[PDB]
Design a protein around this ligand. Structure first.
Ligand code: HEM
Ligand SMILES: [Ca+2]
Ligand SMILES: [Ca+2]
Ligand SMILES: [Mg+2]
Length: 306
């Protein structure tokens, strides 16, 4: 079956408002939570489709994706997903899937932060299983080459236009020293820092992230506007201020089609927002469970009846 915008119209007509209100409240005590929630939809959709597989906790039969590399000591906001789900169950018992919660939460989080709105497609059902191993092989790493990140997007059905647009989600949220410290001292065995990192930002990060220091310390992905959803992410790349290798590679890779897409988005926020919305719908359409497949989870952490 197809996902559609009006799936909950007759059963939980206020779902969008409930999700948005809940995240607005969460934002008052955690300005990062919107960023964290949209990343959960990304890590969901990239493994066994947008099926809420990532939300399942370990059991005797389930090996949770929360311990997959990209998620461990990194993914967050699971409690807030639970609170969104509780609010929906209070209003609309048994109706909204956890998979749809993550799609709805992504749009709310982006719009609340000053980003675009878009028409969320709905009707996804929740998996009965998790895929930790697939998370380890399917989700791109910040130190991968542009060609290998591109390959991982293509394997789930997103193209280069989608990659550059969706990378703009790094306009908000945080990253730890450990996922960019290879840039700072001895980049790829060369004995020198990554030359595509601005020397000013370099010295700031060397002090934040000393060689013998903690890899868990965080900074902002977007030093311009850390919590605001805007095109500043792309402007940063133009001044060698992207934080991850995978960020800066979009602009600094010689002869890459991605350079012009970066400059389009830096030059025109409307074009960025239009592309971002379309690419989020594209990502949200990856391998949904529909009809009899999957279930509607009561509690996003566990399968029904368990
Ligand atoms: C293009 C390939 C991508 C790579 C290599 C990548 C990598 C990462 C890494 C390494 C972090 C830092 C994790 C931390 O240290 O705890 C991060 C954070 C984040 N990513 Fe990405 N990412 C990618 C694409 C995306 C996409 C497609 C989205 C959503 C549309 C997304 C949304 C975010 C957000 C919002 C955060 C901040 C999360 C938070 O503060 O809790 N990323 N990403
Ligand atoms: Ca999934
Ligand atoms: Ca920003
Ligand atoms: Mg600038």
């Amino acid at each position: 079956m197809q996902l559609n915008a009006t799936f909950y119209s007759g059963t939980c007509p206020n779902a969008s408002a409930i999700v948005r209100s809940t995240i607005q409240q969460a934002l008052q005590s955690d300005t990062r939570i919107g960023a964290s929630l949209i990343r959960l939809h990304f890590h969901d959709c990239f493994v066994n489709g947008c099926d809420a597989s990532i939300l399942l906790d370990d059991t005797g039969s389930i090996q949770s994706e929360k311990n997959a590399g990209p998620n461990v000591n990194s993914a967050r906001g699971f409690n807030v997903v639970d609170n969104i789900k509780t609010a929906l169950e209070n209003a609309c018992p048994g109706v909204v899937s956890c998979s749809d919660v993550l799609a709805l939460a992504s749009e709310a989080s982006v719009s609340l932060a000053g980003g675009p709105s878009w028409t969320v497609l709905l009707g996804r059902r929740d998996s009965l299983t998790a895929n930790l191993a697939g998370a380890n092989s399917s989700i791109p790493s910040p130190i991968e080459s542009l060609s290998n990140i591109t390959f991982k997007f293509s394997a789930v059905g997103l193209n280069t236009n989608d990659l550059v647009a969706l990378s703009g989600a790094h306009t908000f949220g945080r990253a730890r020293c450990g996922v960019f410290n290879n840039r700072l001292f001895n980049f790829s065995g060369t004995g020198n820092p990554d030359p595509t990192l601005n020397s000013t930002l370099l010295s700031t990060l060397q002090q934040l992230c000393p060689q013998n220091g903690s890899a868990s310390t965080i900074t902002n992905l977007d030093l311009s506007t850390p919590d605001a959803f805007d095109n500043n992410y792309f402007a940063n790349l133009q001044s060698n201020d992207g934080l991850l290798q995978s960020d800066q590679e979009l602009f600094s890779t010689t002869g890459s089609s991605t350079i012009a897409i970066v400059t389009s988005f830096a030059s025109n926020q409307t074009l960025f927002f239009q592309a971002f919305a379309q690419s989020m719908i594209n990502m949200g359409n990856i391998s949904p469970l529909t009809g009899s497949n999957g279930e509607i989870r009561l509690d996003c952490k566990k399968v029904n009846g368990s």
